């Protein structure tokens, strides 16, 4: 299975999970039931950026699966791969929205789940200033808790805002990593779809700071690529869904670095086994100056 086929398989799995969870939400709560994220002004940010539509009820959430379906075209060309990554991102957002409408408190501490607009505005000032020179999106599991803690604290000591997805949260807790918004170590959630909660940070950064109106998807992608200094460090074995989510990160212009053997793409998808050089490799790949 080559890179394109891996991304397409991951996007289809994300679509299947989104369809299942949306069906569950439709069964339990009804199509008139409200759909929203806590304290946001852009409804579902990824769908709002891609199309301009605001998802307000469960029926519209079910109708948002058509966006995911239309973004998956299985032809081995780079544009289709980027669109398939975006389909995975939209599907992950739909899954998170369904989680919020199904459970009153989908995320428990230390996971924070969705990040509200006021937090985005608070982080915007140090973002453009340079006190936050980048965003380290750490996903998966490191071979040890010690190495995960070392990498996370290396990013933290450099001022980067690091977000954690997956078992790396538990490894960092075992590694005595101090977490919080002021400590710049944000645990999003144990599921892969929780990575969308940092993706919407970039998307809304284009909506708030950039002033790009909703539906101008190419302008949003250009803004995230040229303004948001985010990158992905994917540790541990990578499923097709993880690779598809990484394709979404690449579609947003965010390079993906991993310790796994993957079909490398220069400046976009890079393998770095040496955990002692992963921080420097990511800073170089994202062109970050400390």
């Amino acid at each position: 299975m080559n890179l394109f086929q891996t991304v397409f398989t991951g996007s289809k799995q994300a679509l299947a999970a989104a369809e299942g969870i949306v069906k569950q939400a439709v069964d339990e709560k009804g199509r008139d039931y409200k759909v929203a994220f806590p304290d946001t002004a852009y409804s579902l940010p990824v769908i709002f950026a891609a199309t301009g539509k605001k998802i307000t009820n469960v029926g519209e959430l079910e109708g948002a699966l058509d966006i995911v379906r239309s973004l998956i075209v299985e032809e081995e060309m780079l544009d289709k791969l980027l669109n398939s990554g975006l389909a995975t991102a939209v599907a992950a957002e739909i899954i998170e929205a369904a989680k919020y409408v199904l459970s009153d408190a989908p995320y428990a501490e230390p996971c924070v789940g969705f990040i509200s607009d006021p937090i985005i505005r608070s982080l915007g000032v140090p973002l453009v200033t340079g006190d936050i020179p980048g965003v380290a999106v750490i996903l998966g599991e490191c071979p040890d808790s010690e190495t995960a803690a070392k990498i996370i604290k290396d990013y933290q000591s450099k001022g980067l805002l690091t977000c954690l997805v997956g078992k790396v949260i538990d490894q960092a807790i075992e590694g005595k990593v101090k977490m919080g918004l002021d400590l710049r170590v944000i645990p999003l959630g144990y599921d892969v779809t929780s990575v969308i909660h940092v993706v919407t940070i970039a998307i809304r950064a284009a909506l708030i700071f950039g002033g790009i109106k909703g539906g101008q998807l190419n302008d949003i992608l250009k803004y995230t690529a040229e303004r948001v200094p985010a990158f992905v460090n994917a540790f541990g074995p990578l499923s097709e869904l993880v690779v598809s989510a990484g394709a979404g990160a690449i579609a947003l212009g965010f390079p993906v670095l991993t310790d796994q053997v993957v079909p490398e793409v220069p400046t976009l998808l890079l393998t770095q086994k040496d955990y002692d050089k992963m921080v420097k490799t990511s800073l170089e790949a994202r062109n970050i100056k400390i």
């Binding site: 220069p266 770095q272 790949a285």
Partner: protein, 628 residues
């Protein structure tokens, strides 16, 4: 039918009609319906019992020549002789280059300009370098290269980029190369009356001969030219007939051998010659190149390219060419007649290529610079005979970027290498983009023009289709010059013609979507590149999604090139049918059975859009075989 897609070509054809001079198009029209027997390859003249012609349609008419040779035998022998002639042309070019290398000296006209390249080549030839004088090394390297041409005992020396698997496959098949002249002689011997009358064996002998061109003759010529005249790097130039200057002396270098054109370029900066050009009433000296010698001087110095093969006559039709200096190969003899209608001095310089009624000034290899200065002085003095009322230079020229040797490509690829990962100075970024599928493949577009095809149409259509399908294109020779004239050799072309993956790659690496890798002998560079990629991936060259295209080929050299490209394991599309349709067995060998032998085969397709589609499908199926 239109004669060309190039507007400057069309304006000069109108001028040639107004001037009452004949062109290659006019002679093609005069030839009318060409002989069917010769077109199918079923005519034989190998002995004076003939001429013999057998039916191109099996089961009808005369079946055998007088000696009993079948249509397949006649076709296979004719094809083999074309391969032998092409191999001879390329090998003679490389032999001259090696002899020039052998005569290099510190204080002479010919020096060593790339010592690192010479040391790497010496490593490839098992020549010691440590603690040695550079010219002693150069002479030893030249001796080894010369031995490759005529050794009768032992094995020849092949470049390290050639995969071990490909060599083992050649040895098992029986096509492993011997000395170049020996293989040419073997082909000529086996086509003699009453020798080889088996099509498969004949084709295998021709493949064996073509390998000595691709991997020994052209390769050594290219690498020694780099050693003596400098490795090409990315450089700007201008292309098409508009580069001629009305108010300057115009000196057009046509042919293939680079030593003469290098010495002419050096002589053009001589203060006495510049002063002489001023004194004859010209603003200066304007050197322009055509065909492969133009490609060489343009790759290494940015000399403007006046035009490719079927434009050579039109260069004279402008009435502005004060001197036309030619060495060997692809020099239309009609130029001698044509220059009578203008003031142009048509100067032959090589004992290998005498042309009747041209001015012969033998280029002296013993004193190359002085000889080049004398020839250039004749061209400059001819400026006084210019008739400015007969001058018409089209205001049509195009910016081009070239100089993409393998070394230059590797240097460009270093830009997209993460320093914390590495390694540097490899083809690894290219291998990565090919394996990931961001690039679907790489295609080489090579070859001449041919009056049978609208000039430059097939080259341009094939190149645009390939780059639109995210296939990166490397170009050589007259195809490269067609791309230069059209405007494809530009960074802007990436966003104008390329597909998404290739546009992203071009933006990241800062290269045009079409890479000009030099002259016809520089096709060896392409081989080198492919080999490196294969050696990096641990596979044979037949496992890669690569292809070669000759949309508008005419020469025996093109036949030899396609043969050795296929024998190396690279599928080749021919835009002009070779004279083999009369032999069904030969057609079946070249287009079907060759894949069993060397993993690649010929594709005959005269429609460029269909050729692009077939190339994409073949690359995709090879990718699926490879798992990428």
């Amino acid at each position: 039918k239109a004669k060309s897609i190039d507007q400057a070509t069309l304006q000069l054809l109108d001028k040639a009609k107004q001037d009452g001079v004949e062109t290659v198009w006019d002679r093609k029209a005069d030839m009318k319906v060409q002989c069917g027997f010769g077109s199918a390859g079923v005519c034989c003249r190998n002995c004076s019992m003939g001429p013999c012609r057998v039916s191109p349609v099996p089961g009808k008419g005369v079946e055998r020549g007088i000696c009993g040779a079948t249509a397949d035998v006649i076709v296979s022998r004719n094809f083999a002789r074309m391969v032998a002639a092409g191999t001879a042309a390329h090998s003679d070019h490389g032999r001259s280059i090696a002899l020039s290398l052998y005569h290099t000296s510190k204080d002479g006209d010919i020096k060593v300009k790339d010592e690192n390249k010479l040391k790497e080549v010496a490593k490839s030839f098992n020549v010691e370098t440590e603690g040695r004088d550079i010219y002693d090394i150069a002479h030893d390297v030249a001796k080894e290269g010369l031995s490759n041409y005529g050794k009768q005992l032992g094995e020849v020396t092949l470049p390290p980029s050639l995969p071990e698997k490909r060599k083992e496959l050649w040895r098992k098949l029986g096509v492993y190369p011997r000395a170049v002249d020996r293989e040419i002689a073997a082909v000529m011997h086996s086509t003699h009356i009453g020798c080889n009358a088996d099509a498969e064996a004949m084709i295998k002998m021709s493949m064996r001969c073509s390998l000595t061109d691709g991997w020994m003759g052209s390769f050594m010529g290219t690498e020694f030219s780099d050693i003596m005249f400098g490795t090409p790097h990315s450089i700007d130039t201008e292309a098409n007939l508009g580069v001629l200057e009305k108010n300057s002396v115009n000196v057009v270098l046509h042919g293939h051998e680079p030593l003469l054109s290098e010495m002419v370029v050096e002589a053009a900066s001589d203060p006495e010659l510049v002063e002489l050009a001023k004194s004859v009433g010209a603003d200066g000296i304007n050197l322009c190149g055509m065909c492969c010698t133009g490609n060489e001087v343009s790759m290494r110095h940015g000399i403007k390219i006046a035009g490719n093969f079927m434009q050579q006559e039109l260069a004279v039709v402008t009435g502005a060419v004060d001197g036309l200096i030619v060495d060997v190969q692809c020099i239309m003899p009609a130029l001698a007649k044509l220059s009578k209608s203008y003031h142009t001095k048509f100067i032959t310089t090589s004992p290998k290529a005498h042309i009747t009624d041209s001015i012969y000034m033998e280029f002296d290899e013993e004193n190359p610079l002085d000889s080049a200065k004398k020839i250039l002085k004749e061209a400059i003095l001819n400026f006084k005979n210019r008739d400015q009322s007969k001058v018409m230079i089209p205001e049509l020229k195009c910016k081009a970027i070239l100089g993409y040797s393998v070394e230059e490509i590797i240097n460009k690829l270093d830009k997209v290498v993460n320093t914390q990962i590495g390694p540097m100075q490899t083809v690894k970024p290219l291998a990565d983009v090919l394996v990931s599928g961001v690039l679907r493949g790489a295609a080489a577009v090579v070859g001449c023009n041919n009056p049978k095809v609208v000039q430059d149409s097939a080259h341009i259509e094939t190149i645009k289709g390939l780059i639109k399908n995210d296939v990166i294109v490397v170009v050589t020779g007259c195809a490269a010059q067609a791309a230069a004239k059209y405007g494809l050799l530009q960074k802007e072309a990436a966003e104008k013609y390329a597909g998404p993956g290739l546009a992203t790659v071009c933006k990241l690496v800062d290269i045009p979507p079409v890479l000009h890798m030099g002259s016809c002998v520089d096709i060896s560079r392409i081989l080198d590149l492919v080999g490196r990629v294969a050696n990096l991936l641990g596979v044979d060259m037949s496992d890669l999604p690569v292809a070669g295209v000759a949309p508008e080929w005419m020469s025996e050299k093109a036949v030899a090139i396609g043969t050795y490209v296929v024998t190396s394991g690279i599928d080749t599309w021919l835009g002009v049918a070779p004279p083999v349709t009369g032999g069904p067995e030969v057609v079946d060998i070249l287009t079907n059975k060759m894949e069993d032998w060397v993993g690649a085969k010929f594709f005959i397709e005269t429609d460029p859009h269909k050729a692009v589609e077939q190339i994409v499908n073949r690359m995709n199926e090879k990718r699926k075989k490879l798992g990428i």
